[PDB]
Design a protein around this ligand. Sequence first.
Ligand SMILES: *[C@@H]1O[C@H](CO)[C@@H](O[C@@H]2O[C@H](CO)[C@@H](O[C@@H]3O[C@H](CO[C@H]4O[C@H](CO)[C@@H](O)[C@H](O)[C@@H]4O)[C@@H](O)[C@H](O[C@H]4O[C@H](CO)[C@@H](O)[C@H](O)[C@@H]4O)[C@@H]3O)[C@H](O)[C@H]2NC(C)=O)[C@H](O)[C@H]1NC(C)=O
Ligand SMILES: *[C@@H]1O[C@H](CO)[C@@H](O[C@@H]2O[C@H](CO)[C@@H](O[C@@H]3O[C@H](CO[C@H]4O[C@H](CO)[C@@H](O)[C@H](O)[C@@H]4O)[C@@H](O)[C@H](O[C@H]4O[C@H](CO)[C@@H](O)[C@H](O)[C@@H]4O)[C@@H]3O)[C@H](O)[C@H]2NC(C)=O)[C@H](O)[C@H]1NC(C)=O
Ligand SMILES: *[C@@H]1O[C@H](CO)[C@@H](O[C@@H]2O[C@H](CO)[C@@H](O[C@@H]3O[C@H](CO[C@H]4O[C@H](CO)[C@@H](O)[C@H](O)[C@@H]4O)[C@@H](O)[C@H](O[C@H]4O[C@H](CO)[C@@H](O)[C@H](O)[C@@H]4O)[C@@H]3O)[C@H](O)[C@H]2NC(C)=O)[C@H](O)[C@H]1NC(C)=O
Ligand SMILES: *[C@@H]1O[C@H](CO)[C@@H](O[C@@H]2O[C@H](CO)[C@@H](O[C@@H]3O[C@H](CO[C@H]4O[C@H](CO)[C@@H](O)[C@H](O)[C@@H]4O)[C@@H](O)[C@H](O[C@H]4O[C@H](CO)[C@@H](O)[C@H](O)[C@@H]4O)[C@@H]3O)[C@H](O)[C@H]2NC(C)=O)[C@H](O)[C@H]1NC(C)=O
Ligand SMILES: *[C@@H]1O[C@H](CO)[C@@H](O[C@@H]2O[C@H](CO)[C@@H](O[C@@H]3O[C@H](CO)[C@@H](O)[C@H](O)[C@@H]3O)[C@H](O)[C@H]2NC(C)=O)[C@H](O)[C@H]1NC(C)=O
Ligand SMILES: *[C@@H]1O[C@H](CO)[C@@H](O[C@@H]2O[C@H](CO)[C@@H](O[C@@H]3O[C@H](CO)[C@@H](O)[C@H](O)[C@@H]3O)[C@H](O)[C@H]2NC(C)=O)[C@H](O)[C@H]1NC(C)=O
Ligand SMILES: Cc1cc(N2CCc3c(c(C)nn3C[C@]34CC[C@](NC(=O)[C@@H]5COCCN5)(CC3)CC4)C2)c2cnn(C)c2n1
Ligand SMILES: Cc1cc(N2CCc3c(c(C)nn3C[C@]34CC[C@](NC(=O)[C@@H]5COCCN5)(CC3)CC4)C2)c2cnn(C)c2n1
Ligand SMILES: *[C@@H]1O[C@H](CO)[C@@H](O)[C@H](O)[C@H]1NC(C)=O
Ligand SMILES: *[C@@H]1O[C@H](CO)[C@@H](O)[C@H](O)[C@H]1NC(C)=O
Ligand SMILES: *[C@@H]1O[C@H](CO)[C@@H](O)[C@H](O)[C@H]1NC(C)=O
Ligand SMILES: *[C@@H]1O[C@H](CO)[C@@H](O)[C@H](O)[C@H]1NC(C)=O
Ligand SMILES: *[C@@H]1O[C@H](CO)[C@@H](O)[C@H](O)[C@H]1NC(C)=O
Ligand SMILES: *[C@@H]1O[C@H](CO)[C@@H](O)[C@H](O)[C@H]1NC(C)=O
Ligand SMILES: *[C@@H]1O[C@H](CO)[C@@H](O)[C@H](O)[C@H]1NC(C)=O
Ligand SMILES: *[C@@H]1O[C@H](CO)[C@@H](O)[C@H](O)[C@H]1NC(C)=O
Ligand SMILES: *[C@@H]1O[C@H](CO)[C@@H](O)[C@H](O)[C@H]1NC(C)=O
Ligand SMILES: *[C@@H]1O[C@H](CO)[C@@H](O)[C@H](O)[C@H]1NC(C)=O
Ligand SMILES: *[C@@H]1O[C@H](CO)[C@@H](O)[C@H](O)[C@H]1NC(C)=O
Ligand SMILES: *[C@@H]1O[C@H](CO)[C@@H](O)[C@H](O)[C@H]1NC(C)=O
Lengths: 733, 734
Amino acid sequence: SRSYPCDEKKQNDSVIAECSNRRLQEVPQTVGKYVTELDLSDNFITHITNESFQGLQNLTKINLNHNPNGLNITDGAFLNLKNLRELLLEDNQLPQIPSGLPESLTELSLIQNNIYNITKEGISRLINLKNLYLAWNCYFCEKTNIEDGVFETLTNLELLSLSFNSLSHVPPKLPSSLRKLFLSNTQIKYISEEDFKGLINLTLLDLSGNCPRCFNAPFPCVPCDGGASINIDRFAFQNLTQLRYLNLSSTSLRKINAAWFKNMPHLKVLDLEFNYLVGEIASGAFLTMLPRLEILDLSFNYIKGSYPQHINISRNFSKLLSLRALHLRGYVFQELREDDFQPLMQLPNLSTINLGINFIKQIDFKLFQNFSNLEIIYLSENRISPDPHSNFYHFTRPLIKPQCAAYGKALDLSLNSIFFIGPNQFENLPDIACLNLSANSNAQVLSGTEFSAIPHVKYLDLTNNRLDFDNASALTELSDLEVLDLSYNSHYFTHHLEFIQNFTNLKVLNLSHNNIYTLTDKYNLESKSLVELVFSGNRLDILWRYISIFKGLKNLTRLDLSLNRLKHIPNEAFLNLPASLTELHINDNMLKFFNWTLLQQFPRLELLDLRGNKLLFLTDSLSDFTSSLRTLLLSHNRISHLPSGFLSEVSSLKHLDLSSNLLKTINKSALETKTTTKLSMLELHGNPFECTCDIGDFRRWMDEHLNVKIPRLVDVICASPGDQRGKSIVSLE
Amino acid sequence: SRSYPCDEKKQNDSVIAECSNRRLQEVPQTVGKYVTELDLSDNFITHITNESFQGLQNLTKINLNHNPNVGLNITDGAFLNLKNLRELLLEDNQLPQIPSGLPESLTELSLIQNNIYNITKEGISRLINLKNLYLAWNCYFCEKTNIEDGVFETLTNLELLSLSFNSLSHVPPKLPSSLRKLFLSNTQIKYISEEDFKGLINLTLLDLSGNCPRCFNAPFPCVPCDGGASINIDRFAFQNLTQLRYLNLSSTSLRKINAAWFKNMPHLKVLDLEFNYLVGEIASGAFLTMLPRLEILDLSFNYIKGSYPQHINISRNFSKLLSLRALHLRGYVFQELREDDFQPLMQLPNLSTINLGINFIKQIDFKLFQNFSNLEIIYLSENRISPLDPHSNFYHFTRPLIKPQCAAYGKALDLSLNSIFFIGPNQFENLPDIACLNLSANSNAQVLSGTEFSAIPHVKYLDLTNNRLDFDNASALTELSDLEVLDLSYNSLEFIQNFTNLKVLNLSHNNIYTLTDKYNLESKSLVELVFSGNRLDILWNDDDNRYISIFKGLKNLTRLDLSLNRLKHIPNEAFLNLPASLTELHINDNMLKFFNWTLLQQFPRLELLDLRGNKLLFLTDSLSDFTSSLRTLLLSHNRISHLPSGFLSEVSSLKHLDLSSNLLKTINKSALETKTTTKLSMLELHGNPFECTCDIGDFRRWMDEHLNVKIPRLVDVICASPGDQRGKSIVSLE
Ligand SMILES: *[C@@H]1O[C@H](CO)[C@@H](O[C@@H]2O[C@H](CO)[C@@H](O[C@@H]3O[C@H](CO[C@H]4O[C@H](CO)[C@@H](O)[C@H](O)[C@@H]4O)[C@@H](O)[C@H](O[C@H]4O[C@H](CO)[C@@H](O)[C@H](O)[C@@H]4O)[C@@H]3O)[C@H](O)[C@H]2NC(C)=O)[C@H](O)[C@H]1NC(C)=O
Ligand SMILES: *[C@@H]1O[C@H](CO)[C@@H](O[C@@H]2O[C@H](CO)[C@@H](O[C@@H]3O[C@H](CO[C@H]4O[C@H](CO)[C@@H](O)[C@H](O)[C@@H]4O)[C@@H](O)[C@H](O[C@H]4O[C@H](CO)[C@@H](O)[C@H](O)[C@@H]4O)[C@@H]3O)[C@H](O)[C@H]2NC(C)=O)[C@H](O)[C@H]1NC(C)=O
Ligand SMILES: *[C@@H]1O[C@H](CO)[C@@H](O[C@@H]2O[C@H](CO)[C@@H](O[C@@H]3O[C@H](CO[C@H]4O[C@H](CO)[C@@H](O)[C@H](O)[C@@H]4O)[C@@H](O)[C@H](O[C@H]4O[C@H](CO)[C@@H](O)[C@H](O)[C@@H]4O)[C@@H]3O)[C@H](O)[C@H]2NC(C)=O)[C@H](O)[C@H]1NC(C)=O
Ligand SMILES: *[C@@H]1O[C@H](CO)[C@@H](O[C@@H]2O[C@H](CO)[C@@H](O[C@@H]3O[C@H](CO[C@H]4O[C@H](CO)[C@@H](O)[C@H](O)[C@@H]4O)[C@@H](O)[C@H](O[C@H]4O[C@H](CO)[C@@H](O)[C@H](O)[C@@H]4O)[C@@H]3O)[C@H](O)[C@H]2NC(C)=O)[C@H](O)[C@H]1NC(C)=O
Ligand SMILES: *[C@@H]1O[C@H](CO)[C@@H](O[C@@H]2O[C@H](CO)[C@@H](O[C@@H]3O[C@H](CO)[C@@H](O)[C@H](O)[C@@H]3O)[C@H](O)[C@H]2NC(C)=O)[C@H](O)[C@H]1NC(C)=O
Ligand SMILES: *[C@@H]1O[C@H](CO)[C@@H](O[C@@H]2O[C@H](CO)[C@@H](O[C@@H]3O[C@H](CO)[C@@H](O)[C@H](O)[C@@H]3O)[C@H](O)[C@H]2NC(C)=O)[C@H](O)[C@H]1NC(C)=O
Ligand SMILES: Cc1cc(N2CCc3c(c(C)nn3C[C@]34CC[C@](NC(=O)[C@@H]5COCCN5)(CC3)CC4)C2)c2cnn(C)c2n1
Ligand SMILES: Cc1cc(N2CCc3c(c(C)nn3C[C@]34CC[C@](NC(=O)[C@@H]5COCCN5)(CC3)CC4)C2)c2cnn(C)c2n1
Ligand SMILES: *[C@@H]1O[C@H](CO)[C@@H](O)[C@H](O)[C@H]1NC(C)=O
Ligand SMILES: *[C@@H]1O[C@H](CO)[C@@H](O)[C@H](O)[C@H]1NC(C)=O
Ligand SMILES: *[C@@H]1O[C@H](CO)[C@@H](O)[C@H](O)[C@H]1NC(C)=O
Ligand SMILES: *[C@@H]1O[C@H](CO)[C@@H](O)[C@H](O)[C@H]1NC(C)=O
Ligand SMILES: *[C@@H]1O[C@H](CO)[C@@H](O)[C@H](O)[C@H]1NC(C)=O
Ligand SMILES: *[C@@H]1O[C@H](CO)[C@@H](O)[C@H](O)[C@H]1NC(C)=O
Ligand SMILES: *[C@@H]1O[C@H](CO)[C@@H](O)[C@H](O)[C@H]1NC(C)=O
Ligand SMILES: *[C@@H]1O[C@H](CO)[C@@H](O)[C@H](O)[C@H]1NC(C)=O
Ligand SMILES: *[C@@H]1O[C@H](CO)[C@@H](O)[C@H](O)[C@H]1NC(C)=O
Ligand SMILES: *[C@@H]1O[C@H](CO)[C@@H](O)[C@H](O)[C@H]1NC(C)=O
Ligand SMILES: *[C@@H]1O[C@H](CO)[C@@H](O)[C@H](O)[C@H]1NC(C)=O
Ligand SMILES: *[C@@H]1O[C@H](CO)[C@@H](O)[C@H](O)[C@H]1NC(C)=O
């Protein structure tokens, strides 16, 4: 009863079948007729007929995206599916909308296809449609033919996306039930009062990319004739009273009509990035019309050739009473004065100030104290001295890593020009708990006084610098430091690390890619609180005086020793690792042998990662050395034989990864498990399986042990003989 | 008579034998007894005896450096039989002691980077002819080097003595008065006394660098003196060195310079004071009035940690450096260069080079450079300007600050690696007549309009590499009417035709896959176009037949580089539309499966065809029918498995054929049966899977009958089959 070729999984009392990226030539008839959702994306399927989904009558969702990785769909192929609600047909080279789609459809996605006609024959009959995605069809094409009144009969439509299509005009006769209307990059130069007149339930309106300002967009940018902007009529948004989201990014706007927001009291998110609104930021009457706006983005609105000394912020910015986040990237200015941000200092909700990519030379950091409730001060990329389903115009990822921001106030001074930490670097700064000084080419010799103005930093990111930590007092002024990131500080590597033992609350230390090959005077690393140490990209092969380099880390539960060019680990060096370790990574090394007997001195070890090595042999009695190892990763190794009693005896082993190895077969004695095992997963893909009659004993064990899940069955391929080469080991006599 | 394993060459009426990097287990006895210089460096030679260089009596120079490559056992008097031996190089050989019994004729002995801890009279005092003695990197971080008292005293002809990177502690006593150059860098010499350099009146160079060092990214161990102490030079230590021209005092942790050191030093030409703490000495320094004949002054990397002053403090006494030609002031670390800061340098007549690199300078008043007598190089790289090897000099930048091809045009200004994100309207106002300009690596995203370089319009060589510039406007850079060399490498085209003198254009790694409106490149003067790292595969296709004659407009073109364009196939019409005037064509590092050799008939001046790093299989039968001028054909790293009959013959102009790293198993009788004479002076065949059976005999006979055709790297032309010949050279068979 092992499912092939899909991975069946009961999700929330509904069996779903994952069948993506499996090189399938056609829709398989070996899919369980009890499944509700089927995902056949990224396959080589070229034909869909009325007999493709026969028997699967309980199918509510079908995914056929990127097939073949054109797709020939016959009329009424999906018509037999009465319970079909969601159908995804993205990137299939469809020349027209499939005729004869089931009436039950509520979600239809026909993104990035060759559909140039939106006709009533394939749309008007689908009255249940709530979400219709028709983006990237007639994109760079000679205009999309939208039949007059094609959307009018779809009285249940809540979302209509026609972005990245040559439209020229807003389609007439749109259903009043619309809540989200996406018309980005649709070549719509004019918006009239009649275009969005009957849409009172509209919460989102996307008019971005129409008359665009070109700025490294991953799609063609062709600006309007003579630097013209989008022409929105004064009363074009007088009926959209429920509008919460308005996207006018890249519309070459120079003037903003305040009358657009008179009958828009609920506007929550406004995107005006990639425009020419420097003058509107300085005076703007529209700022007094947004009392409930929480996110305002005015990024990349700079005037070419203009590098002003200060940013001109209108006094009307004090009227944005609900403002939580202000994005002012790419304004391009030289100095941030205390009186420049006066209109923002009394806003109670303002927690995020985004000033990234502004080429600011000086900032009066005392102004940040005068703010009501700032939590994120993003100043990355400044000159301070000592996918069709994504948002294309606005940064969606967090400005600061959530693990850093959770500690408290965050300041991001990364990619700046702080080549050394001056004595006044952090004077007059609020109580900063998260600090990012990444990629500053900082070559500071740390002495223990550089962070005295902000001593409550709990998360310090110093990655991509050339810092000096020879002094045992380095960073010790930060007595509450819990996370220290010193990745990519390989320039410095006397060579000391004695500062680490002074911290009373240091939990995570990352010393990755520091190329540490030598340690002067003190050769050991000590700490009573350190829980995780990342030592990847270093030279442990040269180090192995360093026999007990990590023994001092008594509280250590996680250790990463990957990418250290380790050919062999001395037996004494392995025994000197912290006994408290619960997770050890020694992946991507050159280990020829591994002494499994030494695992007896690690009673809490739950994860042993030995991937990307050159291991050959395995121990006969692993149960005698481990009684806690729950996960063993051994992928990309040279193991050619599984020993007798390896799968058995180790009761704690729940996940064994033997993929990408040299296993030709698994004999009867190797899998003759005398005792019961809670092994819930076994990865075996990428092995050169000799598919002769010898593999039959392993195949029998797969049927007798259905609890042991073997993922990627299509990738567990036979190497020999010629008649079975390429085929899965589960599909044999 | 084909030399093996060395490449014999008569250089200036003297036959020299190059035998380096050839995996030789021992010194070969198959070296011509008529050679004068022998280079056996980078080999696996482990033993040298008196029967190693027998018969080679005319040997004047022997190079045995790096043997074995990654110790060397030399017996006593091994080189004693060589009466004409003058130069002997024994660097990096793990020699535990100086070889006993060296020939008396030796004038140049180099024993660099060895395990020599004793400089004894047994191996040194007998060599009275020695003029140059190099003993560097021997007892480097043995407690101290044991230099026998008076070991150098008998060497009355010694002009150069190098004892750098050795634990010396003290300057060796009894040095010959004939010394002209004394190198004592990184020798742990904390104190210099009056008696240390007393009897050396002919000394022209003195190296005391790295003694009490200031640590700064040095590729060797740096251990500073106790309590931050500097080198202690006595007041009268240099009172007898009247002929001193070169003084290296770099990395000596100096804080004060005694002016009395230069009182009896009127010829001091080069002074090195980089990597010290002389910020205060630069601001007041009494020593500046003692150097009237100094031409090169280096005060780089003398910054005070934590100190970022608003201006550089230059002493008024800098006006006393009347012979100054080059001033190096890198790593001072300051914020502004004002007009009145460099006033003491403005009336010096010889001052042509000002080096202000790595200074973190935020703003410079560029009008001050006009007020200089004769500036030719203004090096401002690695600053914050905004819109509007044991045989090398370790502490000094020996390579040219500006590329000589750029500097030759005239005044050069290097503003690379600065914070100029866009060219402001006042960027170049008040600048001298700049003929060479470097604006590389500035992250410059300027949309060029034809007015950005109006203040400096006589720029002949413009370097704009590693930027993000926009050249859509046909007026871009056209204000520079005398532009001859334009470098736009790594900036990932109607402006090109406006230039009347543009000779070299480099558009490498711009990833040009599409051209809007005008699809062709035109120019009447362009001689060389570098189009590597672009997307010619996308441009050339049976759908968008718009870029079929993309380079036809370049009528004066003689050199074209089309490498790294991912070309799998070149359309026949696209190849025929290339400039007929081409004399050098590079299509290397592509994915070409086929090459239509017939099309070479439309290129009568083509002398070099580079087709390396491709996947070519087939060659034409009658190449002479298509070419009558191809002098060099490079075909290395290809899948060619057969040489056609009459390929080597018929093409009289072919002087260099490169068939190395291919799949040639053999060269049959019909393939090399040359009916007509040839002027083929070179044939590279290494890296081929040569089937060394009796079939290779016909090719071996041709090698003896054609000695004029030189086959380089004979040790690398290795047999693949059979097992008994695998690894051996094809020339060493029955
Ligand atoms: C103009 O500005 C507007 C905003 O003012 C932008 O609108 C947003 O566009 C993006 C991209 O199209 C939308 O993001 C996607 O939303 C989908 C639906 O979200 C709902 O359902 C999920 C649960 O499934 C909830 O968690 C969520 O809160 C919503 O209730 C998601 O399914 C998408 O997620 C998937 O794709 C992304 C990207 O590949 C992955 O990162 C995810 O992990 C996941 O796989 C996605 O998040 C967004 O919802 C729109 N906003 C609104 C309010 O509707 C326009 O895009 C912008 N125009 C341009 C051209 O930039
Ligand atoms: C220097 O070294 C440090 C320490 O290793 C690195 O920082 C850690 O980076 C990892 C990712 O590489 C972080 O781990 C991730 O955390 C995410 C957020 O955690 C929250 O949500 C989870 C639930 O999902 C909670 O359990 C948790 O308590 C938090 O509330 C997780 O969502 C991530 O999970 C995903 O990936 C892992 C595999 O990495 C899978 O096992 C999961 O199933 C899931 O798919 C992930 O765990 C970690 O939090 C960071 N630690 C710190 C202290 O910041 C630095 O990145 C490194 N620096 C450099 C430059 O390399
Ligand atoms: C302290 O400061 C002094 C200067 O006052 C430095 O001295 C120089 O040191 C370098 C390196 O040791 C010397 O450079 C070498 O000179 C050799 C001899 O040069 C003469 O002969 C050649 C012809 O063979 C003439 O062209 C030349 O003008 C001289 O007449 C050269 O043979 C060397 O060249 C070879 O090596 C280099 C480096 O690998 C290659 O680039 C070359 O192509 C070639 O293969 C080399 O140029 C220099 O001569 C010294 N100056 C003086 C005046 O003698 C100290 O080095 C410095 N100390 C420290 C520690 O930095
Ligand atoms: C963008 O593209 C341009 C054009 O290709 C590049 O600039 C050229 O770079 C090459 C090197 O890559 C330069 O060529 C070298 O010039 C040296 C100096 O030339 C003088 O001396 C020679 C005699 O040696 C005279 O014949 C000549 O007329 C000059 O007076 C030569 O010494 C070099 O020769 C050595 O290398 C070549 C192989 O490259 C060997 O064949 C020689 O035997 C010898 O070993 C060499 O020829 C060239 O001068 C540059 N041209 C210009 C206009 O500057 C840019 O570098 C490139 N930009 C980037 C970033 O890649
Ligand atoms: C401190 O600031 C630095 C610099 O802004 C932050 O580093 C950046 O982190 C992001 C997210 O981890 C990286 O983005 C991703 O990079 C990968 C790899 O190139 C790319 O494939 C993704 O599309 C995405 O761009 C970004 O590259 C990285 N930049 C650098 C220079 O390292 C860092 O995360 C900040 N730290 C904290 C604590 O917030
Ligand atoms: C204009 O300024 C740029 C930036 O300084 C110059 O480029 C630099 O040129 C030098 C010499 O060609 C390069 O140095 C060498 O680079 C190789 C490769 O990394 C390295 O192996 C050598 O040891 C040496 O460092 C240097 O890397 C290169 N830098 C950059 C960023 O390209 C350029 O030559 C100047 N142009 C003119 C006309 O002077
Ligand atoms: C007033 C004005 C502004 C201009 N802008 C052009 C460049 C730019 C601007 C903004 C905003 N974004 N961008 C793109 C980029 C951001 C960071 C960068 N650099 C880096 O990321 C690296 C990181 O590492 C240190 C060195 N810089 C890579 C891309 C450098 C420009 C402003 C221009 C252009 N022409 N004229 C006349 C201008 N006039
Ligand atoms: C007054 C003062 C000066 C200091 N210095 C340290 C760094 C430094 C200085 C000088 C001179 N040289 N160096 C090295 C380096 C040059 C260019 C660089 N960066 C780059 O090459 C790259 C390339 O272009 C893009 C980004 N920078 C790489 C290496 C950035 C420093 C001055 C220090 C240190 N601690 N304290 C308290 C200081 N106090
Ligand atoms: C669909 O599911 C129901 C239970 O929800 C079941 O009774 C019915 O037989 C299923 N139909 C098919 C075709 O599997
Ligand atoms: C401030 O934010 C809180 C929610 O975090 C919200 O309840 C409150 O109304 C906001 N203040 C204003 C003036 O909008
Ligand atoms: C904070 O800002 C207000 C204006 O909003 C100003 O009156 C006050 O003086 C500022 N406080 C400080 C300490 O500068
Ligand atoms: C090391 O740090 C301590 C504490 O700040 C300081 O006293 C000492 O001078 C520092 N060492 C050096 C050489 O700067
Ligand atoms: C060990 O680590 C845990 C988890 O971070 C922490 O609670 C505990 O205090 C640490 N032990 C000591 C002795 O610091
Ligand atoms: C494993 O380590 C122990 C202790 O160092 C040693 O006695 C034993 O021989 C090692 N076993 C293997 C297989 O190398
Ligand atoms: C050395 O060269 C001379 C000619 O310069 C020649 O007469 C003599 O025979 C040569 N000696 C040897 C051993 O080759
Ligand atoms: C200036 O340089 C020339 C050689 O270029 C030299 O003859 C002249 O004496 C120098 N001037 C001084 C004052 O040294
Ligand atoms: C040039 O420098 C001299 C001092 O050496 C100064 O007097 C003169 O005014 C300067 N010339 C200009 C035009 O600034
Ligand atoms: C192109 O350059 C010309 C000449 O300077 C200028 O008139 C024109 O405005 C430029 N084009 C743009 C779009 O800036
Ligand atoms: C062609 O190039 C040569 C060499 O640079 C140059 O002398 C000649 O003037 C150029 N021809 C024309 C017509 O510009
Ligand atoms: C070479 O090019 C000519 C002209 O385009 C064409 O007729 C001929 O067939 C080609 N030869 C080969 C070998 O492809």
